[PDB]
């Protein structure tokens, strides 16, 4: 009756890794539709499926970030979705094409670094992460979840001297030996076909499933375009995602509900390292048409739905609004994008970040001009 | 640079398993203080520490529940907290005192079932859980997290014929061989000393840390008292937790803010199995003094902060309120306690449950008398 599972079988059965493994109601689910307009998707979807995509996307946005290591130059992240096949490719240095001595002993066969990265659970370059490292990745798990939910997958990486191609098939059951050839290219690509039918979807995807998933991925790519460094262009199905600022994100999310609106902007800064290395970009819209407070937070490349950084903004605005009114956040839509050192995620899904609220009180300052303009707009509505 | 971790080392370093491993701001943190009054704890605390306690408590509440197995009779759950030492004991059948053949081969030594339960990750009786099983436990992880965050721990279990005592020390590094003796007792006890200092606390606990943690545990025990079956009494430091109904919970949470209030009650039922086996108990208070909607949900023994069961209640009330007003949830405090089959938790912490919203629409009915009285109270406030 007491059973012992391995990681691979556990991940196919257990919602704890990536969320539910069939379709459920995902409150707040959005996608982008073509001007770009973010719109709700009021149909049930599988959280673990969307997480396949997210794990690959955050791995790509992580790559340009140095954590006490040599700088890496990434000029593109290319995301593709067609005929059910999903791929994500970025340049910058490839995953090292070299034998991993420890994994080879554990496996009793030659195992190269990219196979460790994609096939070994609890394995990666962030196992001993510094508290100030602002990569989203931390557990050495996410890429393996993508593989375990794929009927077939191909990892291709090149390092400027060699290219490494490896098939990882049947939900990680069948790892084929890699093919290594000479090459002058340099990139990392993951291409896969999710187990759609096992996750509740039609085989092949229905028209509506395809449209919803494409819209979700496109919006995730647009979020990345605002987060990544100035040198990186994001593409979705070869089209550049032209949402490189928090203002552009705010406009896309409010185009239906409050077109031609004022966008209040702020760069929230800190004086002391490590916080001073990481300004937070903010854009907000205030409208009486908004039914409840909403934020979109892209923190360390992750779409965060809950965290004390939001509360810091809301409480600071509220204090001012109460004062000005006496002479409060339900009319606000706010976008917050940037890196925060020292946060801890509450699960592999990275839905919620955890931190002492006093980090923001001690270290960060919200510009008075933004607070004053937000307060004026909110009070006008209240009155 | 690419490192491979084992589960034990990963759990000591990674917030994904139990939450942050030092003190952070936990919005909504509450404890009970002595009449019983639930009050906020406005000090940062370590989520993983509180999760040690929760994992043991949910294991105890799970024990009486049959999932297509023989019925188990549990008459008590005794929780203790003194001098930093935490223990949880329940009766009912003990963990089997028998050699585990598979674990013994993996370990190359004699390993008994209770050592598998407490020391092997991804191991337990719920690995192949039926979708209709309403135990909180699912992953085969929680007890190991308790051990990995203990400087010392003792597992004691008895099966009516033998007693098994095993020391599990130094954050799972040092598993001592068990001592097995004849016995007529029958129970399962876990006693441990958390690694307080490593988790941010004083050694020994400060007066305030001790008071906060005791209050948190006591409130968690009171929540259990409303969830468990009629035959089980919950004790905290030997005192019975006299909060056996949702009404008693609602009163304790509103005693400071709205004493002597009306408590609206409902039992939400479904007609079809498996849902019809699991009525949901509800108690709500409506007051203009409440600043925002709040719920306390004990679902499958777990304190759930987010789930579509709440949304089902809010939307049903809102529809009525809009209609009656025209001739809405911020004045509500609501307690919901019961089992829901087919939910999936989003992480090991079980903060959020996932389900299709249509489960409630199709299967469950909220009594009209409760909806009507709630609506009258809410509309009176609006007007
Ligand atoms: N697109 C990529 N480009 C370059 N290196 C990559 C890429 N994707 C993954 N890697 C490497 O492969 C490792 C394993 O990835 P992954 O399993 O996602 O773990 P992680 O990103 O470190 N942590 P997490 O995603 O929180 O589980 C990473 O640590 C990187 O070193
Ligand atoms: N108090 C207890 N009384 C009896 N059996 C217990 C008790 N605690 C744990 N067990 C058994 O030990 C197993 C391992 O517990 P645990 O590691 O918490 O896993 P789980 O409860 O099945 N799943 P999860 O808590 O979601 O990780 C359980 O499946 C039970 O069979
Ligand atoms: Mg990753
Ligand atoms: Mg458990």
Numbering used by the authors:
A (entry chain A), B (entry chain A): 3 to 36, 40 to 332, 346 to 401
List sentences quoted exactly from the publication behind this structure.
However, for these theories to be broadly applicable, they need to be demonstrated for large and multimeric enzymes that catalyze complicated reactions. The enzyme used in this study is a type II DNA topoisomerase (Top2) from African swine fever virus (Asfv), a dimeric multi-subdomain enzyme (271 kDa) that catalyzes multistep reactions to modulate DNA topology. AsfvTop2 has been found to be involved in the early stage of viral gene replication, and also detected at the intermediate and late stages of infection. The domain composition of AsfvTop2 resembles that of the canonical Type IIA DNA topoisomerases (Top2), including the well-studied eukaryotic counterparts, which form homodimers. The catalytic process not only involves well-coordinated changes in protein quaternary structures to allow timely opening and closing of the N-, DNA-, and C-gates, but also ATP binding and sequential hydrolysis that relate the dimerization and catalytic activity of the ATPase domain to the mechanistic steps of the cycle.
Furthermore, the ATPase domain of AsfvTop2 in the MgAMP-PNP-bound crystal structures coexist in reduced and oxidized forms involving a disulfide bond, which can regulate the AsfvTop2 function. Next we address a new regulatory mechanism unique to AsfvTop2. Structural analysis indicates that the structures from reducing and non-reducing conditions are without and with a C72-C138 disulfide bond, respectively. Interestingly, the disulfide bond formation involves a large movement of C72 to reach C138, along with relocation of H73 to pair with D137. The formation of disulfide bond between C72-C138 and the involvement of H73 are supported by mass spectrometry and NMR, respectively. Kinetic assays further indicated that the ATP hydrolysis activity was significantly dampened upon oxidation. Thus, formation of the C72-C138 disulfide bond is most likely a naturally occurring way, in place of mutation, to enable the regulation of the ATPase activity and presumably the topoisomerase function. Importantly, this disulfide bond-mediated regulation of ATPase activity has not been shown in other Top2 enzymes.
